[PDB]
DNA sequence: CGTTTCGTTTCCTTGAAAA
DNA sequence: TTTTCAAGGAAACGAAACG
């Protein structure tokens, strides 16, 4: 067979001239057609059986000739398929997608062009035989023959309706004119007549032919190959349906041959839907006939969107409907449904900035809301008069498109919490923004007027942003279409930045930040902002007031712990990004806004705190202490370094952490939560560094012999944790504070695990000609760490590890001599997650016991566990 | 999923153990 | 260690809309 | 009838799992 020799590997070969030859030579030869025609399809299949000329001569024993060649696959082992996975892979199989798929199907798709030339298509006789053997050949059970029997007929079937049309719009309808024009007035030709009349004939009787051909290959092939039981020979049947319906309009686009989609948009298989939701879309650009699908299969269409087993269906489900609220054939009552899609249940799956799989859910159902904002946007303008005037001359345009996507995002909202589980307010905002995010490019251009929006000095009437509880939804919606602006696109975003920046001071000016709802978007736009979109903008001027009036907010109200307060990361943000900017007037602020803090603490623990006081409230001070001043300088710390005169940590070390045991019997379970020592690791982790700043100072010029005193902060810092530690470790058990004193605990021994690592770190990070340094470092420091703390740090981690086995419910092995009552552990509402807060602790741990601080016997009861808790306890043991 | 949290880990322990950005670049070891 | 499978980014081709 | 933009797909590099 030298057919196949010139087909599977030639690439840039013409594919017409080679037709010619076996069209003129079947007039010439007859069975030496056929042969090499068969024999070119079984190639394909993986098999070395043949078909002679004798065989495929016999042209009405089809049904033998082609069960004779049947065995020889069957009974045949080794078999592989060389189109169907060059078709899906070029670089994997040995034929490539180029010389077996493209040329391939052109061979086919344009085989009837050449026929027309030589006068073999009408002559007939030979499209009879074509149709005896593809029939017979597309009916067997092995996958292999049947797939490329059907494909074959299908590559036919698409240029009949082209041709069909050609031939009705360019010979028919052009040779209707030309007899028309030979009829008026008293004047026939006779001569033409007849050669008009003859060439019409033909014109029309092409057309039944070809029609034929078509209802024969519809009637016995398509009908009986869409309910086939594999998959891709199931969608490649419906693939080239679309071709056929888009060409051939008067025998194909009808009612009865348009069920066969509302048929298999609910099936078994997951590669036909796929195939029917991306050609359904083309059906509507076309345009009663073609309604009459929509309006009894929409809902289906909706169970589809919703409710589908396969992710890469609704995306194009919704873009068919899409189009179906653009047309208008979706009710109100059934947009709701939809519209509530970008709510999905899942938080923050995948990833955002990447474009994944949950972001082009979210961007078609964005595309999908731009048409019915449209579509009611310009309904809503003819039903109710325009008044003459508004705010500034008339905003016809963006005042009416924002007023009403006020209500739908809010009713989307709605309609998805009513059905769900109510939650909390913070696990609104974040779908609010995932959702919001992206709505962008949807509503981009007409932003600015949401802005003044904000400051509602001016009114306007509706007849048949106002209270508080709508102001926050309105913020937080604006404020994550502010983030999510910047990740999708280009040139849509330096707009909206030179648009929107100047109008933040008015904002935080006109609306009161007196509640943290307020403050919570309108800071998280400001993340979003650098040096380049504040410079390029030419309004750096206002950043300098801008810093000032957060400040303001920031000392007048008070802030707690991050478990309650929303505020803690709030202002952590808002610093770490305005650090970031790296200016030095911004600095300056901050450390005077530190200094005057400082100030207001000292001037609170020396008469507030005092010992020499019989107030017994301590529970109603100690919060106020740590949300006034103490979780503030907690958070400026961060990125502005502070600094402590010892005479203030003497009266704050003094008043308050070596006094905390008879403070401790009027603590609640709320009061203890507030309390962290993160701030006295901050004062050594400074006082650690800005010495580090001065070992930078070897390479210049200009030690002044403190070295004993610049100690004694630190050292005073150690000794009163490691007393604190000691005091807490003898305390009443009872069920009541059992939480909040292993809480405590837990705490300090973090802060103390933290400055006792750094300053083993600063040690022996040191060079080995400061000597001078060295010896006051053991001279200043007699213990790092105390062995009764050790006791106190074993206990906090067997409390953690039990804790964890209560959890997992799995026992411990221990020692003997051990306090084996805390196996069945209380409920503790300080741990929100135990697994984390247990493999940190369990890594501090190791930490100090890899700088030697630990003794061995700790190693031992630490590591004995290691099987019991997982891979992650062993990772600790050994790495 | 719940036991299988290698990756996790390492976020979880630079999020929950530093908050300032200076120090903990040379109060961490290697 | 090296492989293998999956996810991401960039470029190329085809199609869809407007002048 | 031609031009431009976008959308889908394929190639290539990278990451994670896996053996």
Redesign the pocket.
């Known amino acids: 067979t030298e057919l196949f020799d010139i087909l599977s590997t030639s690439e840039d070969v013409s594919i017409e001239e080679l037709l010619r030859e076996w069209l003129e030579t079947y007039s010439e030869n007859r069975d030496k057609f056929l042969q090499e025609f068969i024999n070119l399809l079984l190639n394909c299949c993986g098999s070395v059986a043949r078909v002679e000329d004798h065989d495929v001569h016999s042209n009405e024993s089809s049904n033998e000739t082609i069960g004779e060649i049947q065995l020889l696959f069957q009974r045949q082992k080794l078999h592989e398929f060389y189109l169907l996975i060059s078709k899906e892979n070029?670089?994997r199989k040995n034929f490539k997608?180029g010389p077996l798929y493209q040329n391939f199907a052109e061979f086919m798709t344009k085989l009837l062009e050449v026929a027309n030339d030589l006068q073999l298509l009408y002559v007939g006789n030979l499209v009879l035989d074509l149709l005896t053997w593809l029939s017979s050949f597309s009916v067997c059970k092995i996958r292999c023959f049947r797939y490329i029997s059907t494909l074959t007929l299908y590559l036919f079937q698409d240029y009949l309706t082209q041709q069909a049309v050609n031939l009705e719009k360019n010979y028919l309808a052009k040779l209707s004119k030309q007899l028309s024009l030979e009829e008026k007035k008293k004047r026939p030709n006779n001569k033409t007549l007849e050669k008009l009349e003859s060439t019409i004939a033909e014109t029309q009787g092409s057309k039944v032919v070809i029609d034929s051909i078509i209802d024969n290959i519809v009637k016995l092939c398509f009908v009986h190959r869409y309910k086939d039981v594999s998959d891709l020979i199931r969608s490649e049947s419906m693939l080239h349906l679309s071709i056929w319906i888009k060409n051939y309009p008067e025998y194909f686009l009808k009612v009865t041959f348009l069920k066969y989609f509302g048929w298999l948009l609910s099936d078994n298989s997951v590669s036909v839907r796929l195939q029917v939701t991306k050609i359904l879309p083309?059906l509507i650009?076309q345009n009663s006939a073609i309604r009459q699908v929509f309006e009894r299969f929409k809902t289906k269409i909706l169970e589809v969107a919703i409710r589908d087993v396969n992710l890469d269906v609704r995306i194009h489900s919704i873009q068919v409907l899409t189009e179906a609220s653009s047309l208008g054939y979706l009710d109100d009552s059934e947009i709701l449904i939809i519209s509530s899609l970008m709510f999905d249940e899942e938080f923050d799956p995948?990833?955002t900035?990447?474009?994944?799989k949950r972001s082009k859910f979210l961007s078609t159902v964005a595309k999908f809301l731009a048409r019915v904002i449209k579509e009611k946007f310009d309904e809503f303008i003819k039903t109710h008069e325009d008044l003459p005037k508004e705010v500034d001359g008339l905003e016809v345009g963006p005042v009416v498109q924002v007023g009403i996507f006020i209500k739908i995002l809010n009713d989307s909202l709605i309609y998805h919490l009513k059905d769900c589980a109510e939650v909390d307010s913070r696990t609104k905002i974040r779908m609010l923004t995932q959702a919001a995010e992206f709505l962008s490019p949807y509503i981009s251009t007409h932003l600015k007027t949401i802005c003044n929006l904000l400051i509602s000095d001016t009114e306007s009437n509706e007849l048949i942003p106002i209270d508080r509880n709508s102001t926050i939804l309105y913020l937080n919606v604006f404020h994550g279409l502010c983030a999510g602006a910047n990740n999708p696109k280009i040139q849509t975003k330096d707009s909206v930045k030179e648009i929107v920046l100047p109008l933040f001071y008015d904002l935080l000016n006109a609306a009161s930040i007196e509640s943290a709802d307020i403050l919570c978007p309108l800071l998280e736009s400001f993340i979003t902002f650098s040096l380049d979109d504040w410079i390029s903008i030419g309004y750096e001027t206002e950043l300098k007031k801008i810093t000032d009036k957060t400040i303001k907010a920031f000392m007048d109200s008070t802030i707690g712990n991050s478990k309650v307060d929303m505020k803690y990361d709030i202002f952590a943000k808002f610093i770490h990004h305005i650090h970031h900017f790296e200016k030095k007037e911004l600095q300056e602020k901050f450390l005077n806004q530190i200094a005057t803090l400082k100030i207001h603490l000292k001037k609170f623990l020396q008469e507030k705190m005092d010992p020499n006081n019989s107030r017994d409230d301590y529970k109603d001070l100690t919060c106020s202490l740590y949300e006034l001043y103490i979780n503030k300088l907690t958070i400026l710390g961060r990125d502005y370094p502070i600094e402590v005169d010892e005479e203030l940590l003497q009266l704050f070390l003094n008043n308050f952490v070596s006094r905390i045991p008879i403070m401790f019997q009027d603590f609640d379970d709320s009061t203890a939560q507030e309390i962290n020592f993160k701030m006295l690791v901050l004062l050594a982790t400074w006082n650690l560094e800005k010495w580090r700043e001065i070992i930078e100072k070897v390479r210049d010029y200009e030690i002044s012999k403190d070295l004993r005193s610049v100690w004694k902060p630190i050292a005073a810092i150690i000794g009163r944790l490691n007393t604190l530690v000691i005091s807490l470790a003898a305390t009443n058990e009872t069920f009541e504070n059992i939480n909040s004193l292993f809480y405590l605990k837990w705490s300090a021994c973090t802060s103390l695990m933290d400055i006792i690592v750094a300053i083993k770190i600063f040690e022996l990070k040191l060079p080995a000609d400061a000597t001078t340094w060295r010896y006051s470092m053991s001279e200043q420091f007699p213990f790092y760490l105390h062995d009764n703390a050790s006791k106190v740090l074993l206990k906090i981690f067997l409390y953690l590890e039990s804790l964890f086995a209560k959890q997992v419910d799995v026992q411990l092995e221990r020692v003997a001599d051990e306090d084996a009552n805390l196996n069945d552990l209380p409920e503790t509402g300080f741990f929100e997650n135990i697994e984390t807060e247990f493999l940190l602790f369990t890594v501090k741990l190791k930490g100090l016991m890899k700088l030697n601080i630990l003794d061995e016997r700790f190693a031992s009861r630490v590591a004995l566990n290691k099987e019991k808790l997982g891979p992650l306890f062993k990772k600790i043991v050994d790495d | 999923p719940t036991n299988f949290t290698t990756?996790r880990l390492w976020s979880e322990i630079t999020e929950s153990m530093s908050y300032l950005p200076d120090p903990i670049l040379k109060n961490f070891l290697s």
Request: net charge positive.
């Open positions: 070029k670089k997608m083309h650009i995948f990833k900035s990447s474009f994944n | 990756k």
